[PDB]
Every structure is written in C-alpha cells, then in structure tokens.
Design an enzyme around this catalytic site. Structure first.
Site, PDB file in Angstrom:
ATOM      1  N   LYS A  90      31.118  44.542  32.605  1.00 12.15           N
ATOM      2  CA  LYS A  90      31.370  45.891  32.075  1.00 12.15           C
ATOM      3  C   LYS A  90      32.510  46.000  31.034  1.00 12.15           C
ATOM      4  CE  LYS A  90      32.438  49.211  35.037  1.00 12.15           C
ATOM      5  NZ  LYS A  90      33.893  49.051  34.809  1.00 12.15           N
TER       6      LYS A  90
ATOM      7  N   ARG B  97      33.510  58.242  40.476  1.00  7.29           N
ATOM      8  CA  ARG B  97      33.179  57.345  41.538  1.00  7.29           C
ATOM      9  C   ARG B  97      32.443  58.003  42.685  1.00  7.29           C
ATOM     10  NH1 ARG B  97      38.166  55.827  39.350  1.00  7.29           N
ATOM     11  NH2 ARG B  97      39.333  57.185  40.832  1.00  7.29           N
TER      12      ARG B  97
ATOM     13  N   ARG C 298      30.965  28.263  40.560  1.00  3.63           N
ATOM     14  CA  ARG C 298      32.079  27.759  39.736  1.00  3.63           C
ATOM     15  C   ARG C 298      33.088  26.873  40.476  1.00  3.63           C
ATOM     16  NH1 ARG C 298      33.702  33.106  36.213  1.00  3.63           N
ATOM     17  NH2 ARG C 298      34.229  33.841  38.336  1.00  3.63           N
TER      18      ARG C 298
ATOM     19  N   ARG D  54      37.702  29.150  43.891  1.00  2.72           N
ATOM     20  CA  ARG D  54      38.623  30.257  44.137  1.00  2.72           C
ATOM     21  C   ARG D  54      38.112  31.039  45.327  1.00  2.72           C
ATOM     22  NH1 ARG D  54      40.734  33.403  38.766  1.00  2.72           N
ATOM     23  NH2 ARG D  54      40.141  35.080  40.221  1.00  2.72           N
TER      24      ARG D  54
ATOM     25  N   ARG E 283      31.798  42.615  47.547  1.00  2.04           N
ATOM     26  CA  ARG E 283      32.141  43.484  46.407  1.00  2.04           C
ATOM     27  C   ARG E 283      30.929  44.223  45.849  1.00  2.04           C
ATOM     28  NH1 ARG E 283      35.567  39.063  44.648  1.00  2.04           N
ATOM     29  NH2 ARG E 283      34.117  38.550  42.947  1.00  2.04           N
TER      30      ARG E 283
END
Length: 204
Positions: A13, A88, A123, A156, A167
């Site tokens: 975004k 939101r 990743r 990570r 999320r």
C-alpha cells in the site's frame, strides 16, 4: 479524486499510495500524520487530542473526524485527497458521511493473502553479509546456509508464516465491514447529500 485506499499489510500500500498521490497531485492523509501536525501546530483539536495521547488513551472518533474536517480545508486538498488507512471502522465511515466528507472511490488493493504470506515468510538472510534468499524463489544451495560462507541463515520473527497470517486476519475483519458498509449505501442511494463511493478492486 477523493479516495479511500485500503490495503492488507504486506500488500505494498505505501508505495501505491505514493504512486497515486504523485499522479493526481493530491495529499496522502493518515490519522498519525494529522495528529502529529495538529499537536505540533498547537491547534485547538490538537491540544485536545494530546490530552488523550499523554494518558495512553484512545483519541475519540469525534476528535479524529474534527481533525479531518480541518485538514480538508487546507489549500493542498483543492484537487482532492487520499485517505490512507482511514476509516478503520463503520462508525468512522459513518461519521465522515455525517460530517459531509465526500468520497468518490473506495480502492482496495488487490493481492491475495497466499501470495503475501508466500512472499514474506520464505525470506531468509545471512546477517553478516546482508545476502538474502527465499525458500521458494531464490533458495540457498544447502538449506539454512549461506552459499558463500556456509553460515546460518535466519528468518525474522515478523515474517513467520503464522505471524503474517495473524496480521492478515485482523486486517480482514477490520476491512470487510467497511466494504459492506459502502456497498450497502451505494445500493440505497444518496445520503446526507452525499453519494456512496464506488468500490474498485485495483491490482492495478
């Protein structure tokens, strides 16, 4: 162009926002930036908002919307504006309507969840060198090792598949009511003298 831009975390975004704002010369409006600017400028709504922020308390909708109306009066919104990550909630959407904030399009950035999860969670990096790898698209020759040094590769914590999925889930539950809210309104017709925004999935 008077826009709401919606996008899942990891959907990119931020860069799309930048592309759109550049193209139409319209400012990117987010609540974070509005609060900080209003607080810094000692505006009356800013001082009021700060009383909540000093206490780690939620700044109420009534105030955010008030900051919105003042924000949209500024010179730079003459050609339009881009809401980034706002509203939101359906109450915020409905406060914006009742406050007379015109919106032409709700654009929802279209990138499937599986692609996002795949992109981020595969990743790996070798920290000493910064070299990156991806378990799928750019695999190391020996699993869990840097090709050059033989040293361990890492992932990570933020990128872990189930962290990413969590999320997306939260975003999803936030966003769906907003899409429904605006779609139902557009089938009902003009309200508070405003037309419902048109919904677009932009991929785009």
């Amino acid at each position: 162009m008077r826009l709401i831009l919606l996008g899942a975390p990891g959907a990119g975004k931020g860069t799309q926002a930048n592309f759109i704002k550049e193209k139409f010369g319209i400012p990117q409006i987010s609540t974070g930036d509005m609060l900080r600017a209003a607080v810094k400028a000692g505006t009356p709504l800013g001082v009021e908002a700060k009383t909540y922020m000093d206490e780690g308390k939620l700044v109420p909708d009534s105030l955010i919307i008030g900051l919105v109306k003042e924000r949209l009066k500024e010179a730079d919104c003459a050609n339009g504006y881009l809401f980034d990550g706002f509203p939101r909630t359906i109450a915020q959407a409905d406060a914006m309507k009742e406050a007379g904030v015109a919106i032409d399009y709700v654009l929802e950035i279209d990138v499937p969840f599986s692609e996002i999860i795949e992109r981020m969670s595969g990743r790996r990096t070798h920290p000493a060198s910064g070299r990156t790898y991806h378990v799928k698209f750019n695999p190391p020759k020996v699993e869990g090792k840097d090709d050059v040094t033989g040293e361990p590769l890492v992932q990570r914590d933020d990128d872990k598949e189930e962290t990413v999925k969590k999320r997306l889930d939260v975003y999803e539950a936030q966003t769906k009511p907003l899409i429904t809210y605006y779609g139902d309104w557009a089938r009902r017709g003009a309200e508070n003298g405003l037309k419902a925004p048109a919904y677009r999935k932009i991929s785009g």
